[PDB]
Design a protein around this ligand. Structure first.
Ligand code: BCL
Ligand code: BCL
Ligand code: BCL
Ligand code: BCL
Ligand SMILES: CC[C@@H]1c2cc3[nH]c4c(c3C)C(=O)[C@H](C(=O)OC)c4c3nc(cc4[nH]c(cc(n2)[C@@H]1C)c(C(C)=O)c4C)[C@@H](C)[C@@H]3CCC(=O)OC/C=C(\C)CCC[C@H](C)CCC[C@H](C)CCCC(C)C
Ligand SMILES: CC[C@H]1c2cc3[nH]c4c(c3C)C(=O)[C@H](C(=O)OC)c4c3nc(cc4[nH]c(cc(n2)[C@@H]1C)c(C(C)=O)c4C)[C@@H](C)[C@@H]3CCC(=O)OC/C=C(\C)CCC[C@@H](C)CCC[C@H](C)CCCC(C)C
Ligand SMILES: COC1=C(OC)C(=O)C(C/C=C(\C)CC/C=C(\C)CC/C=C(\C)CC/C=C(\C)CC/C=C(\C)CC/C=C(\C)CC/C=C(\C)CC/C=C(\C)CC/C=C(\C)CCC=C(C)C)=C(C)C1=O
Ligand SMILES: COC1=C(OC)C(=O)C(C/C=C(\C)CC/C=C(\C)CC/C=C(\C)CC/C=C(\C)CC/C=C(\C)CC/C=C(\C)CC/C=C(\C)CC/C=C(\C)CC/C=C(\C)CCC=C(C)C)=C(C)C1=O
Ligand SMILES: COC(C)(C)C/C=C/C(C)=C/C=C/C(C)=C/C=C/C(C)=C/C=C\C=C(C)\C=C\C=C(/C)CC/C=C(\C)CCC=C(C)C
Ligand SMILES: [Mn+2]
Lengths: 260, 273, 305
């Protein structure tokens, strides 16, 4: 013996592997279908019908019931983005990049875009709110270490837009998700923690510029910050990087973006 | 592709040297300078490989490969069959890689995200290069590397593995294997951890963050939150890949004769016989 | 610096409140463990709600015992003098029955034995730890998954030291305890079963093992880059997807031409991370029993140089 066998050198071990690739090949198929719940339904438009196409190995749904009085959601993307975008053609073959119809950031298109998202504060385990201002919660306390509260936030150009006032924290997961900037006009605006550096001497926002600051879309409400506003602040904050430094392109290198 | 949402975000930018020219989604893909500079730098590798094969034998997937120049064949990029095809598959390949790597920085950049994946990728290159152009260059014989061939590159692994005894005993392997292992643990756990939440027992509520964070606390007696585990994500697996490469670059040189004899030092220290 | 999201920028800590009361008989969760600045710099400073309960205790008892035995069984012959125990901790196995009595628990002290007793308790420990994972999953929701995923692991564990030896009609094939030695049994297991790299299963297992380090290096990588506005918080997005998702989606749709999203990313991941053991275990159950000298099998099919 050297591997017992059935019909023509096809052993019990041989049986095992043909069977494996017989159904795993199917697994990929399933999870790939399951993977395209969103997006993939409607990339075709009825200005003219189908002779071109819209892929459809697409699955049969179920419904995510949102705990918080939220409701029921069917994710197979019945998507109709009802918002506007400032963009238009630059040639007729769809792969070509198609320009912003006048500055992005103010109306968000390109790398600095936000998106509609049920205009209500994020789910906590408890019905309570999630992200809540440090100046308003049961004992949260950065101890002896550099809480940026009394130092000027500063962008690319100058430190003349930098009254830091209070950290803005996530209550369950204990993380400081926001720094609050009382802009030179008593306007509190927040910034996404990751995109700013806190040197024990100043807060550097290599993300944006001294200006462009007084634009981060106001959280029009004092305490409750939220999606339509949360995806918006980060969105316009991102508008630095690509669209900030006037220099519309440039080879790069390690240390702070080209510096000065 | 056309990925519905895509529509908006499809704008110019990025590009390290492809200025404005050479940045148009060839269908679902993104042709950028490096995008082409991969394809060329790549294909000229497939052609070189495909042909080189038509001078040694059978037109078969699982039966060719690529052996470097002999051992004391010096170093100097010798013949175009007795190991030079390798050096022209490598410079071609290594390049193709480095390109796709930085290509990501391009695409990544023009979408506001952060140059973070290629970093995690630069470790895979750091790996390859150790056992192809680092370990070999050390002791001159550009044979100590490995032949690109499917069923035949497993053989190098063994023929060099046992050249040192039972490689197991070799250090790095040990702690490096630990992270490779522990990678699975992580994901496996994170792999259920949200699908469990996202999908709870029948007509119940979509168990949210807190529950993830409790369950684990409520089992291991700890949970690292939601950013926490996606941190380990690199560190665990990636450090594995780093540590793995130590496993070899050292063996050649820092220590020659058979392992099982290193760990013999602890076994002897004065006080202990 | 922190412009790349690795270690945390600022240290906010608050009142450690116990947490969830959902069905879970709150009566067993402990009080509050220490907070920790160090672990804090990574992702979450707390000790937390260790819930010492019913079937839990049972596990750690058997486990600490499975341990104690091997310890005593280390000690008992180990030139006792606790000046060497440290030294020869490594080369120190206490291999299962050497001679073949067959699966006969009537194997004594020296000539094996060890195993039966010890192995008995480890057999419970893990199974009782499989226990937890289900009841503790049932106590709120948490589908089942985190338990069902472990079955895969517990499977090869049983195949490697329980099922297979039961098919050769002999425990000797038992991947016994000790450090250095399990490491060695593993080597000539292949070098008697014909250079294992030739086996279709140990081969797919390594491909899948390697595949997991890849997928987590990717998920992780994709996230801290996208962690500028919500990527970090995965579920809410499987219910209301902002640009963390969308932007993270494009990235791949561009680089490689097709991508996942949220539920899908981890529905892919669990599978690719579980299969490592599943698949890998199947092949280890075929070696020996239904196939000696692997290479041959391969040689009949194609497995060429
Ligand atoms: C998979 C194929 C072989 C095999 C091949 C190898 C090879 C090859 C190696 C190991 C190594 C290891 N194996 Mg093994 N091993 C096998 C089966 C097993 C089984 C089992 C079947 O039940 C166990 C319990 C182990 C256990 C171990 C560990 C002792 C060790 C690191 C694993 C790890 O970090 O886990 C994952 C991690 C965790 C669960 C997190 C915690 C880590 C724990 C479990 C162990 C820490 C041990 C050490 C690093 C620290 C001790 C500190 C003290 C203060 C001294 N192996 C099978 C039969 N194993 C490696 C080693 O370096 O050992 C010396 C090594 O090189
Ligand atoms: C130190 C580790 C060793 C090594 C040790 C092993 C061992 C051990 C095994 C393999 C196995 C494999 N190795 Mg290896 N392998 C090494 C380096 C490489 C390199 C390289 C770029 O350096 C490549 C491309 C491969 C590729 C492969 C696979 C084709 C095969 C399963 C891959 C896998 O891990 O699943 C993960 C894979 C993915 C997630 C994606 C697939 C990877 C790509 C697409 C493969 C491309 C094939 C080729 C480049 C096509 C050229 C043209 C054709 C010849 C006509 N190896 C190094 C040198 N490799 C396994 C095998 O042979 O069994 C089937 C196996 O058991
Ligand atoms: C050395 C001789 C062989 C060889 C022989 C073997 C043998 C023999 C085996 C493997 C197996 C494996 N081999 Mg090999 N293997 C070789 C070379 C390789 C190479 C290589 C790059 O050269 C690679 C990448 C691999 C990779 C692998 C893995 C894919 C695979 C499964 C291991 C695992 O993930 O965890 C393994 C998983 C477990 C141990 C799960 C069990 C966990 C338990 C339940 C934990 C309990 C904890 C306990 C109660 C308490 C202690 C812990 C406390 C915290 C203190 N092998 C060489 C040629 N390989 C295994 C297999 O069959 O897969 C195909 C196996 O048995
Ligand atoms: C078999 C005899 C010896 C042995 C000898 C050796 C030797 C010799 C080496 C290893 C090495 C390794 N061993 Mg070993 N090993 C043994 C037993 C073991 C066991 C075990 C359980 O038995 C394990 C788990 C391991 C595990 C490992 C790994 C930790 C490590 C490779 C990691 C890696 O990513 O490489 C990093 C490289 C890659 C991941 C390849 C990436 C290639 C590039 C960058 C990308 C390719 C893309 C591709 C071309 C795209 C094509 C796609 C198509 C276009 C679609 N070994 C014993 C038994 N081991 C290796 C090592 O030290 O580390 C490398 C090594 O050299
Ligand atoms: C899906 C991928 C595979 C997998 C999956 C997996 N493992 C798992 C799970 C899953 C899904 C769990 O849910 C389960 C778990 O809950 O942990 C996450 C677990 C688990 N996987 C484990 C290990 C493990 N998994 C491994 C691998 C894998 N696990 C695969 C990759 C490995 C490898 C291969 O190395 C190991 C080592 C366990 C830690 C844990 C379940 C263990 C358990 O049952 O515990 C019971 C009790 C004990 C073992 C006793 C503990 C001993 C003491 C700590 C010693 C102290 C002794 C001292 C004498 C006392 C005090 C005196 C002092 C002087 C010391
Ligand atoms: C931290 C290191 C870990 C890692 C990370 C990682 N890998 C990555 C990435 C990341 C983050 C990517 O972004 C990149 C990717 O896009 O895929 C996800 C990638 C990648 N990891 C890959 C593979 C891979 N990674 C592995 C491992 C790892 N990757 C580590 C565990 C492994 C194994 C099994 O360990 C493999 C097989 C690729 C899928 C991909 C990067 C390569 C790439 O896609 O390049 C595109 C190339 C071409 C279209 C053709 C160019 C080359 C050819 C024309 C051939 C030229 C000659 C040839 C190279 C000779 C060698 C032949 C071999 C048979 C030996
Ligand atoms: C998003 O959501 C998510 C989470 O969050 C909700 C999560 O969590 C996770 C998942 C979690 C992870 C990825 C973490 C993975 C790891 C684990 C589950 C394993 C945890 C267990 C261990 C680290 C311990 C293993 C057992 C051991 C070490 C026993 C052997 C020890 C020794 C001989 C001791 C030698 C010690 C020394 C030199 C230093 C200490 C010495 C002293 C204090 C002096 C001597 C005295 C003692 C040791 C005291 C006695 C014993 C003690 C303290 C123990 C995921 C995926 C997730 O997606
Ligand atoms: C949350 O977010 C996230 C996602 O989700 C947004 C994700 O996904 C992921 C990523 C994870 C996954 C997708 C899960 C599974 C991952 C893996 C198994 C990793 C392994 C992948 C590889 C092996 C792929 C490697 C690279 C390739 C294939 C490059 C492609 C090269 C060619 C096709 C060469 C020949 C063709 C050319 C040049 C173009 C010709 C095209 C046309 C004329 C049009 C028609 C084209 C096609 C049919 C192409 C194929 C199309 C398909 C499959 C549809 C992460 C991390 C994530 O965080
Ligand atoms: C008390 O000791 C002190 C503290 C003083 C000192 C220290 C002691 C130490 C550090 C001891 C260490 C022990 C170690 C490190 C042990 C390591 C063991 C390892 C690495 C084991 C590896 C693999 C083990 C395997 C695969 C075991 C498998 C076991 C089984 C599959 C069980 C099979 C099932 C059986 C016997 C029962 C079946 C059913 C019935 C009803 C009987
Ligand atoms: Mn995740």
């Amino acid at each position: 013996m050297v591997g017992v066998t059935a019909f023509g050198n096809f052993d019990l071990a041989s049986l095992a592997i043909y069977s494996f690739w017989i159904f795993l090949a199917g697994l990929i198929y399933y999870l790939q279908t399951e993977n395209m719940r969103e997006g993939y339904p409607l990339e075709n438009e009825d200005g003219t019908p189908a002779a071109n196409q819209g892929p459809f190995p697409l699955p049969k749904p179920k419904t995510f019931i949102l705990p918080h009085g939220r409701g029921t959601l069917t994710v197979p993307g019945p998507e109709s983005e009802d918002r506007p975008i400032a963009l238009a053609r630059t040639a007729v073959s769809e792969g070509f990049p198609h320009a912003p119809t006048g500055d992005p950031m103010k109306d968000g298109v390109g790398p600095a875009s936000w998106v509609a998202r049920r205009d209500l504060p994020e789910l906590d385990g408890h019905g309570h709110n999630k992200i809540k201002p440090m100046k308003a919660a049961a004992g949260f306390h950065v101890s002896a270490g550099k809480n940026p509260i009394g130092l000027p936030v500063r962008g690319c150009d100058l430190e003349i837009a930098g009254k830091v006032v209070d950290i803005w924290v996530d209550i369950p997961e204990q993380m400081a998700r926001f720094l609050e900037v009382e802009l030179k006009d008593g306007s509190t605006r927040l910034l996404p923690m990751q995109m700013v550096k806190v040197q024990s001497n100043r807060v550097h926002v290599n993300a944006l510029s001294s200006d462009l600051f007084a634009g981060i879309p106001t959280i029009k409400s004092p305490t409750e910050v939220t999606l339509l506003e949360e995806d918006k602040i980060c969105g316009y904050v991102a508008g630095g990087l690509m669209y900030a430094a006037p220099k519309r392109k440039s080879v790069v290198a390690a240390m702070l973006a080209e510096y000065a | 592709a056309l990925l519905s949402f895509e529509r908006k975000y499809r704008v110019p930018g990025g590009t390290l040297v492809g200025g404005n020219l050479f940045d148009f989604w060839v269908g679902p893909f993104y042709v950028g300078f490096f995008g082409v500079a991969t394809f060329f730098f790549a294909a000229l590798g497939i052609i070189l490989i495909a042909w080189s094969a038509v001078l040694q034998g059978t037109w078969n997937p699982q039966l060719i490969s690529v052996y470097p120049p002999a051992l004391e064949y010096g170093l100097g990029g010798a013949p175009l069959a007795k190991g030079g095809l390798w050096q022209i598959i490598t410079i071609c390949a290594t390049g193709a890689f480095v390109s796709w790597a930085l290509r990501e920085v391009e695409i990544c950049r023009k979408l506001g995200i952060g140059y973070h994946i290629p970093f995690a990728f630069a470790f895979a290159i750091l790996a390859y290069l150790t056992l192809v152009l680092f370990r070999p260059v050390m002791m001159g014989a550009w044979g100590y590397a490995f032949p690109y061939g499917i069923w035949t590159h497993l053989d190098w692994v063994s023929n060099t593995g046992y050249t040192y005894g039972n490689f197991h005993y070799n250090p790095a392997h040990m702690i490096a294997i630990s992270f490779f292992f522990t990678n699975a643990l992580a994901l496996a756990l994170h792999g259920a951890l949200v699908l469990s939440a996202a999908n709870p027992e029948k007509g119940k509520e979509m168990r949210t963050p807190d529950h993830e964070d409790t369950f684990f606390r409520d089992l291991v007696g700890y949970s690292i939150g939601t950013l926490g585990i996606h941190r380990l994500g690199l560190l665990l697996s990636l450090s594995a890949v780093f540590f793995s490469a130590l496993c070899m670059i050292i063996t050649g040189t820092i220590w020659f004769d058979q392992w099982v004899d290193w760990w013999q030092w602890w076994v002897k220290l004065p006080w202990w016989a | 610096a922190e412009y790349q999201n690795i270690f945390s920028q600022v240290q906010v800590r608050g009142p450690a409140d116990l947490g969830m009361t959902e069905d879970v008989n709150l009566a067993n969760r402990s009080g509050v463990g220490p907070f920790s600045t160090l672990l804090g710099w990574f992702g979450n400073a707390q000790l937390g709600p260790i819930y010492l309960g019913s079937l839990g205790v049972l596990s750690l008892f058997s486990g600490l015992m499975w341990f104690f035995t091997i310890g005593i069984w280390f000690w008992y012959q180990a030139g006792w003098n606790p000046a060497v125990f440290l030294r020869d901790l490594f080369f120190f196995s206490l291999e299962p029955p050497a001679p073949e009595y067959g699966l006969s628990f009537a194997a004594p002290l020296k000539e094996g034995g060890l195993w039966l007793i010890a192995s008995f308790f480890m057999f419970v420990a893990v199974w009782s730890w499989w226990g937890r994972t289900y009841l503790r999953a049932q106590a709120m929701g948490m589908g089942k998954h985190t338990a069902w995923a472990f079955l895969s692991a517990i499977w090869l564990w049983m195949v490697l030291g329980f099922i297979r030896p039961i098919l050769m009609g002999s425990w000797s094939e038992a991947v016994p305890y000790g450090i250095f030695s399990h490491l060695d049994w593993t080597n000539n297991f292949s070098l008697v079963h014909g250079n294992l790299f030739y086996n279709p299963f140990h081969g797919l297992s390594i491909a899948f093992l390697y595949g997991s380090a890849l997928l987590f290096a990717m998920h992780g990588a994709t996230i801290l880059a996208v962690s500028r506005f919500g990527g970090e918080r995965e579920l809410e997005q499987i219910a209301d997807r902002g640009t963390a998702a969308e932007r993270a989606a494009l990235f791949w749709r561009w680089t490689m031409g097709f991508n996942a999203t949220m539920e899908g990313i981890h529905r892919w991941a669990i599978w690719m991370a579980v299969l490592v053991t599943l698949t890998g275990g199947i092949g280890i159950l075929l070696s020996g029993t239904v196939v000696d000298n692997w290479y041959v099998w391969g040689q009949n099919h194609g497995m060429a140089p």
